[PDB]
Amino acid sequence: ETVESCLAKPHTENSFTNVWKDDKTLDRYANYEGCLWNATGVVVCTGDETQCYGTWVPIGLAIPENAAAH
User: Fold this and answer.
1) Radius of gyration of the chain measured on its C-alpha atoms
2) DSSP letters spanning 2-45
3) Domains: count for the chain
4) Range of the domain at 63
């Protein structure tokens, strides 16, 4: 994936369902097939928080945190 475009995205303003949370990445993240957003705190969650919306800053193609796996 083009991490440049995945980041050129609107930056968070969006959402995703079936969201997950990596203890490695250390944060909330939504696998947008090819893209990976990241939720912080204020994130509307429903269904045990499996689906949510709010700000999902873009950072990985589909799993890496914001530090870029450093």
Assistant:
1) 11
2) -HHHHHHS-SEEEEESS-EEETTTTEEEEEETTEEEEEEEEEEE
3) 1
4) 1-70
Sheet holding 20-22, edge to edge: 12-16, 51-60, 35-46, 27-32, 20-22
Q: Residue 41: phi, psi to the nearest 5?
A: -120, -75
| Beta-carbon contacts of residue 9 (< 8 Å; ≥ 6 apart) | 35, 37, 58
| Residue 31, domain CATH | 2.30.27.10
- Using the Cα atoms of residue 64, residue 22, residue 58 and residue 15 in order, give the sign of their dihedral: positive
Question: Cβ distance 39 to 56 under 8 Å?
Answer: yes
CB 3 within 8 A of CB 63: no
